Amino acid sequence: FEHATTVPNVPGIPYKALVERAGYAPLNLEITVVSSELTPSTNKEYVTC
Amino acid sequence: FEHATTVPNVPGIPYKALVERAGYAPLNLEITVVSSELTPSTNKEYVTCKFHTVIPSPQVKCCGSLECKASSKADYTCRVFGGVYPFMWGGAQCFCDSENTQLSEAYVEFAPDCTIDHAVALKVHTAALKVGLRIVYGNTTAHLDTFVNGVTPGSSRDLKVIAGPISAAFSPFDHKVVIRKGLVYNYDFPEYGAMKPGAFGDIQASSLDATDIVARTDIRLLKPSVKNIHVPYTQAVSGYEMWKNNSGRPLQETAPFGCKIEVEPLRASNCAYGHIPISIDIPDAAFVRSSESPTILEVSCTVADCIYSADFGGSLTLQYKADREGHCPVHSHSTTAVLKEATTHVTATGSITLHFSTSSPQANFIVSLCGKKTTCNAECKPPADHIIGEPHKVDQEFQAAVSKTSWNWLLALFGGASSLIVVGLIVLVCSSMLINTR
Amino acid sequence: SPTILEVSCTVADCIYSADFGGSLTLQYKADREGHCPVHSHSTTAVLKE
Numbered sequence: 001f002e003h004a005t006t007v008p009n010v011p012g013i014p015y016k017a018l019v020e021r022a023g024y025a026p027l028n029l030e031i032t033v034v035s036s037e038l039t040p041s042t043n044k045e046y047v048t049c
Numbered sequence: 050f051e052h053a054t055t056v057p058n059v060p061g062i063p064y065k066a067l068v069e070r071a072g073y074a075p076l077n078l079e080i081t082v083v084s085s086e087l088t089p090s091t092n093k094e095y096v097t098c099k100f101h102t103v104i105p106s107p108q109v110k111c112c113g114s115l116e117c118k119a120s121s122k123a124d125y126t127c128r129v130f131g132g133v134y135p136f137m138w139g140g141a142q143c144f145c146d147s148e149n150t151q152l153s154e155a156y157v158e159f160a161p162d163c164t165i166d167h168a169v170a171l172k173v174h175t176a177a178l179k180v181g182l183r184i185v186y187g188n189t190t191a192h193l194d195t196f197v198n199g200v201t202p203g204s205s206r207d208l209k210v211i212a213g214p215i216s217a218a219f220s221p222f223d224h225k226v227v228i229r230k231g232l233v234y235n236y237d238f239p240e241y242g243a244m245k246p247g248a249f250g251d252i253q254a255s256s257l258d259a260t261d262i263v264a265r266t267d268i269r270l271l272k273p274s275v276k277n278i279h280v281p282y283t284q285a286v287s288g289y290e291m292w293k294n295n296s297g298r299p300l301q302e303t304a305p306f307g308c309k310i311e312v313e314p315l316r317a318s319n320c321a322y323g324h325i326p327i328s329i330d331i332p333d334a335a336f337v338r339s340s341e342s343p344t345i346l347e348v349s350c351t352v353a354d355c356i357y358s359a360d361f362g363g364s365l366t367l368q369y370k371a372d373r374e375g376h377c378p379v380h381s382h383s384t385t386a387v388l389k390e391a392t393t394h395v396t397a398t399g400s401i402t403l404h405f406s407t408s409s410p411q412a413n414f415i416v417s418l419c420g421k422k423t424t425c426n427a428e429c430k431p432p433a434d435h436i437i438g439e440p441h442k443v444d445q446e447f448q449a450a451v452s453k454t455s456w457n458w459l460l461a462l463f464g465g466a467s468s469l470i471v472v473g474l475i476v477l478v479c480s481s482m483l484i485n486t487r
Numbered sequence: 488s489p490t491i492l493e494v495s496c497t498v499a500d501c502i503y504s505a506d507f508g509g510s511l512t513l514q515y516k517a518d519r520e521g522h523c524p525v526h527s528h529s530t531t532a533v534l535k536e
C-alpha cells in the first residue's frame with residue numbers, strides 16, 4: 001500500500017499515523033528520524049600552516 | 050413442508066434462506082450448486098481424417114483392350130490409356146509396339162494413424178441441465194443430482210427437490226459440432242454425401258473400421274508420358290489438414306458463461322447462467338417446535354468496518370440476552386447482503402460476531418436470530434483492492450446500489466423542484482380565487 | 488481485528504507542553520479480545536502509544 005505523508009526533520013519525535021486500507025484493519029505506522037546527515041561535496045584547494 | 054425459492058446457477062456461492070413454518074421454529078436452508086452439466090443429445094454423422102490415396106499397381110494389356118468396371122472403393126477413379134509402352138528395370142514390358150493399354154486406378158482410404166488423428170461430426174440438439182446440489186437443512190447435509198427440467202425429483206429419497214426450468218436456455222453448442230482429440234469446434238460440416246473436395250469432409254465413413262467409405266477427393270489421372278511405368282495423378286489437398294491449419298480456437302476457450310467443455314458424453318461443465326427455481330419438500334422431522342428453540346429477549350446489531358465486496362468484507366456483532374442456551378439460525382433478510390454463518394450458539398447473554406458480504410454502499414438490512422429481527426445501520430466503504438479471485442456472492446440492485454447520501458441529495462433536489470411546482474400552482478389557485486371574487 | 492461495540496474517552500489532567508502531559512482513558516466494550524491500533528486524528532495532539 002502506497003502511503004504518502006510528511007514528517008518533521010527533528011531527530012527523535014516519532015511521527016505516528018494510521019494506514020487505512022479499505023478492506024483491511026487500520027494499521028499503525030510511525031516514522032522516527034534517528035539521525036540526519038548533510039554531506040556536501042567538497043573540493044580540496046590547498047593546505048596551509 | 051414445501052419451500053419454493055430461486056437460486057443462482059453459479060458454482061459455489063451458497064444461497065441461504067430461512068424456512069418459517071408457523072410454530073415450528075426458523076429452519077436454516079442453504080443450497081449450493083456444486084456442479085452443472087449441460088449435456089445435449091448428439092447424433093454421430095460421420096468420421097474423417099487424412100486419406101491415404103493408394104494407387105494400385107497398373108495393369109497393361111498389349112494388342113488388346115482393357116476397359117474397367119466400377120468399384121465400391123472410396124473415390125474410385127479409373128482411366129484407360131491407349132498409347133503406352135512401359136519400362137521396368139529390364140527394358141520394355143510387352144511386345145506390342147503401339148497398341149498397348151494401361152489401366153490407371155486411384156482410390157482413397159483411411160490413413161493408418163486415423164485411430165487417433167480423426168474428427169467426429171455430430172449434430173447437437175437441445176441440451177438438458179443436470180446440477181449437483183449440496184443442500185443443508187437444520188443440521189443435516191444432502192447431496193443430490195437433479196435435472197433442471199421442472200418435473201423430475203431429486204436423487205435423494207428422504208427429501209424431494211424439484212428444480213424448475215432455467216430462465217434463459219443457453220446451449221453453447223451450435224447444431225453442428227466437430228470433436229478432434231478432445232477439442233470441440235463449432236464447424237458447419239457437410240452432410241453425409243454432400244461433400245466437396247478440399248474442404249473438411251473430403252472422406253466420410255460411419256466408423257473408422259467401416260468398409261462403406263465415401264469420398265470425393267478430386268483425383269485426375271494424367272496420361273503417362275515417360276519411359277518408366279508410372280501413374281501420374283494429381284489431387285486436392287486433405288480437407289482435414291486444411292481445416293486443422295485454420296480451425297481457429299476450440300470451444301474450450303471461446304465458450305460463454307465460463308463453461309468448461311468435455312467430450313466423453315460431450316457436456317458443458319460449470320456454466321454460470323440464469324436462475325434455477327427450486328422447490329424443496331423438507332421432512333417434518335427436521336423442524337423442532339418453537340418451545341425448544343431459545344427465545345431472544347432483546348438483540349442489538351452493531352456493525353463496524355463494512356466493505357461492499359465479493360469477499361465477506363463486513364462484520365456485525367449481535368448483542369443478546371436470551372433465556373436458554375441453544376442454537377439459533379442467523380439470517381439476513383435482504384437480497385443484497387448475505388451472511389457467512391447460518392447457525393450460531395446462544396448463551397443466556399453475550400455477543401456473537403457474523404461476517405457478511407454485500408454490494409450496497411449502505412448496510413441497512415434486517416438480521417434475524419431465532420426469528421428475532423433487528424435492523425443494522427452503517428455506511429459501507431468501497432473496497433481498495435480492485436481485483437479478487439472469487440465471484441460475487443450477491444447481485445447488484447438499483448435501490449441498494451445508490452447510497453443514502455446520494456439518495457438524500459437526489460430526493461432533496463427533486464423535492465425542491467416539486468415544491469416550487471406546488472407553490473406555483475397554489476399561488477395560481479389563490480390568485481384565480483381572488484380575481485373571480487373581485 | 489477486534490471490533491469496538493462502544494467507546495468513550497474521558498480525559499483528566501491534560502497540560503499542553505513538550506512532555507506527554509495528560510491522561511485520557513477510553514472506556515470500551517468489544518466482542519473479541521485482541522490487540523488494537525490507537526490513534527489521535529489531530530495534528531495538534533499526539534498519543535504516546
Ligand SMILES: *[C@@H]1O[C@H](CO)[C@@H](O)[C@H](O)[C@H]1NC(C)=O
Pocket residue numbers: 187188335337376
Ligand atoms: C444438530 O446437531 C447438533 C450437534 O451439535 C445440535 O447442537 C443441534 O441442535 C442439532 N440441530 C437441531 C435442529 O436439532
